[PDB]
Write a protein that binds this ligand. Structure first.
Ligand SMILES: *Cc1ccc(-n2ccnc2-c2ccccc2)cc1C
Ligand SMILES: *Cc1ccc(-n2ccnc2-c2ccccc2)cc1C
Ligand SMILES: [Ca+2]
Ligand SMILES: [Ca+2]
Ligand SMILES: [Cl-]
Ligand SMILES: [Cl-]
Lengths: 7, 228, 228, 7
């Protein structure tokens, strides 16, 4: 559910 | 399989595959470029990362769908097919980790390259940890932690707090703490300290660098909002 | 490669692959199910079609990106990579057409199965025609036309004007006329006549069948709006 | 640019 790095 | 293609052609075709959203091709082209044995430029490192992140991202999404179906069920088919996808995912992670270990990391002397590759190493051990269950899961988790930690130590010594690689590394290490290591307080503290120290360094940046840094700071804030 | 798996397990895994959006896997599972040699049910035909339509749809989208880059350019790399994708697309079309010819179509006696498979045959020859340039392009186009035409003849004799397969066949044959055969007037006439005859048959349908039919009628209307 | 059949 959490955000890791993404463009 | 790419040994007979020129390095420059592999890079050019990686960029074309990205435009075509053919990320498996993109990864194979960038794997071939790495295997030429020369160090990678900043742009080339980004191509490598984008390619494998998209490949493994599709595998992770599929694995989560299947694992969820499997848990609601618990014949052999759902388990078998989850295992198939899981094995394919592990193979892609092993391939990336093999590229980092032979020999991207050992030849990476600059902070920007070395931190980038160590972040990747942490990420792909993290993806292995997401599916791990056997006698090696603790060692997989510690391998992710160790790679992330070395990257953090270098980034804090060598990079400003707003550096996009430093920010993305801290973001992903915080997700590791929350999702993998069952350390939500460590995750929250890292995200908060990272956000605050970057905020205090924004005044040094150009308009374009400001946009790069604040974009990743927003992901840190999104997680803090989810976690608190 | 699927010869050792049970037919029922291949079908079950095709459905799991669809939920996981793993359409290459889905196609391989359904190919294995077809190769068991038994006829396919209505649901199984839909799984086969969904799997290969998604695989070839990604290839077509990539080919269009690359062909567009190639035309703006006119080294060898863009042409080479477009050719690679094109060859992979042709191989998938050949695989589907081989399944239809060995031996789905010849064993299909009911209108719903025979029309479905002949529509597929027209579709995959149409996809071959989209990339064709050599001495066989006219024959490829006529192969698509002939399959579509036989399907139309059966559908008009055996199915009501609102039947979803009949509607989807007419939709795709109209796209063939417009995009492939350079017959936009034939495309428009077919779409219009198909829409109008289905409209006049809607009163016979249940609420659920009404929804099925009007959904495809909307695609016919969308094309007429684009074309006129 | 035109629509063929889709789910
Ligand atoms: C893991 C990661 C963090 C940040 C970035 N990123 C965002 C904006 N610019 C960059 C960048 C640019 C050049 C080199 C490295 C990072 C990208 C990634 C993959
Ligand atoms: C080519 C095509 C046209 C219509 C449909 N469709 C839409 C709604 N229901 C169906 C259907 C259901 C069972 C069997 C065949 C078609 C699907 C396709 C692939
Ligand atoms: Ca070096
Ligand atoms: Ca039969
Ligand atoms: Cl399997
Ligand atoms: Cl190529």
């Amino acid at each position: 559910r959490p955000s890791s790095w993404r463009q | 399989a790419m040994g007979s293609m020129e390095r420059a052609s592999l890079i050019q075709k990686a960029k074309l595959a990205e435009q075509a959203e053919r990320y498996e091709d993109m990864a194979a082209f960038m794997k071939g470029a790495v295997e030429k044995g020369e160090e990678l430029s900043c742009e080339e490192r980004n191509l490598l990362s984008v390619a494998y992140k998209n490949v493994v991202g599709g595998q992770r999404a599929a694995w989560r769908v299947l694992s969820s179906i499997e848990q609601k069920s618990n014949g052999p088919e759902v388990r078998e097919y989850r295992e198939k996808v899981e094995t394919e995912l592990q193979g892609v992670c092993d391939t990336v980790l093999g590229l980092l270990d032979s020999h991207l990391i050992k030849e990476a002397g600059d902070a920007e390259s070395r931190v980038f590759y160590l972040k990747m190493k942490g990420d792909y051990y993290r993806y292995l940890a997401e599916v791990a269950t056997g006698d090696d899961k603790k060692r997989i988790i510690d391998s992710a932690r160790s790679a992330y930690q070395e990257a953090m130590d270098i980034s804090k010594k060598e990079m400003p707090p707003t550096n996009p690689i430093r920010l993305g590394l801290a973001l992903n290490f915080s997700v590791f703490h929350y999702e993998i290591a069952n350390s939500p307080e460590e995750a929250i503290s890292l995200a908060k300290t990272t956000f605050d120290e970057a905020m205090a360094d924004l005044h040094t940046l150009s308009e374009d660098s400001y946009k790069d840094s604040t974009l990743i700071m927003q992901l840190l804030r999104d997680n803090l909002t989810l976690w608190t």
